[PDB]
């Protein structure tokens, strides 16, 4: 019916914006503990709203290809859904030399998306639907 | 003898990762091997590690998570070798990831920086023969 304290209501969704960083899997588990999920972006207006609140900061979202194809954490279909990748992304870059490609999506400093190493610590956003 | 895939140098055995881990994960990996994250105590050891890692950010066994700077094997920091980059350590909070910077790594020129412990970097394990 309503969002918990320190959460922001927007278009029937509640959002919590971290002010600290976590590896993607740890951010994912943090959102689950709160009965939420990492933010799932399905429109230009929702993208604009998230971008306004995070500012120019690398921030994890609930999109990954750890099991093969790109998937949203709540089952929202990727192929038929909203996409806002940065130019030349996703690229599954191995050149970071950290092992593996890049399997986790994050907003970049301009809001557009990048795939990065899931173990990098970034700020994240939780979302729950009313 | 050092184990297979380890490099012998001046009575120590070293293992150089080709993948990255958060400092506590790298620390756990080295202990599993009855080793410890590399402890650098001389200019010759520093030059040796530098040669094998190249210009890559790499964790070492030096941290200030519990207060003062400490080497993982109990080697005294104050009286020991130091090779910090200029203006380092700085315990930078500006990364916005939470806390300052408590873990030391070699930088692209071999000199040390303190950084966020949860950052995935390559690492070096060391064991003494
Ligand atoms: C934070 C960020 O945007 N990283 C990107 C960028 O840095 C290297 C790379 C390939 O050039 O582009 C690779 O795609 C990374 O994932
Ligand atoms: C990889 C690396 O050397 N990072 C450093 C460098 O980047 C930001 C900072 C302060 O400006 O300097 C801070 O000291 C970081 O720890
Ligand atoms: Ca949503
Ligand atoms: Ca990938
Ligand atoms: Ca990428
Ligand atoms: Ca040593
Ligand atoms: Ca510190
Ligand atoms: Ca620093
Ligand atoms: Cl990082």
Curated annotation (Swiss-Prot), chain A:
* Binding residues for Ca(2+) 1: 40, 46, 127
Post-translational modifications reported in the UniProt record? Phosphorylated on a cytoplasmic Ser residue.
Sites binding Ca(2+) 3 sit at 89, 91, 102, 114-115
- What are the cysteine partners in each disulfide bond? 3-14, 31-126, 104-118
Tissue expression pattern: Expressed exclusively in hepatic parenchymal cells.
Residues annotated as binding Ca(2+) 2: 65, 92, 102-103
Q: Which domain of life is it from?
A: Eukaryota
C-type lectin domain location is: 10-127
Q: What does this protein do?
A: Mediates the endocytosis of plasma glycoproteins to which the terminal sialic acid residue on their complex carbohydrate moieties has been removed. The receptor recognizes terminal galactose and N-acetylgalactosamine units. After ligand binding to the receptor, the resulting complex is internalized and transported to a sorting organelle, where receptor and ligand are disassociated. The receptor then returns to the cell membrane surface.
- Assembly and oligomerization: Interacts with LASS2. (Microbial infection) Interacts with hepatitis E virus capsid protein ORF2.
Q: What else is known?
A: Calcium is required for ligand binding.
Q: What is this protein called?
A: Asialoglycoprotein receptor 1
Recorded source organism is Homo sapiens (Human)
Q: Which gene encodes it?
A: ASGR1
Residue numbers of the full-length protein present here: 152 to 281 of 291
